[PDB]
Amino acid sequence: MFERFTDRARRVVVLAQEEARMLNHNYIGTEHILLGLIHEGEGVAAKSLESLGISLEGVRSQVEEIIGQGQQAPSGHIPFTPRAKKVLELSLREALQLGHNYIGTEHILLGLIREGEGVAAQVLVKLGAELTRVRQQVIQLLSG
Amino acid sequence: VVXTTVLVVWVFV
Amino acid sequence: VVXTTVLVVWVFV
């Protein structure tokens, strides 16, 4: 109970909404959480990717090519898709597995992958970001 | 250990 | 345009 999102993880989600605004999308999907993850580009999630050979601007144009752009930009709140909601919930499940009592960008990466159906997961696994592999780069990196 | 999935201001209860 | 960034029930306010 009471697991807190890190201030870095919170930014990823705030960023997720704006990525979708820039693209004129009227939703926040898993892809925009991955763009947010990329946009803050600083956490354990970003280093776990780069440390596996994955270029975060490669990821960004890969995702941007798949989802395109919207006609016009919407206002106020843009709703999170259910599967984007399920990423954040799988982040907590991935943090707990490791025995962590917080949710940071590392766990958001794992939940994006574990979600296993969205644009973000499809892009990630095409680039070796396999779950158990990313789990291990997360653990060795976190050791300290 | 006890898991709650309400998202409430960035914390899961 | 008012763009609050507190997350309430999955909605920003």
Numbering used by the authors:
A (entry chain A): 1 to 144
B (entry chain D), C (entry chain E): 1 to 13
Per the authors:
ClpC1 is an ATP-dependent homohexamer that is responsible for substrate recognition and unfolding. ClpC1 is a 95 kDa caseinolytic AAA+ protein with an N-terminal domain (NTD) and two nucleotide-binding domains (D1 and D2). The essential ClpC1–ClpP1–ClpP2 proteasome complex of Mtb has recently become the focus of several drug-discovery campaigns. The NTD (amino acids 1–145) has been studied extensively to determine the most critical residues for the binding of ClpC1 to several natural cyclopeptides with potent anti-TB activity.
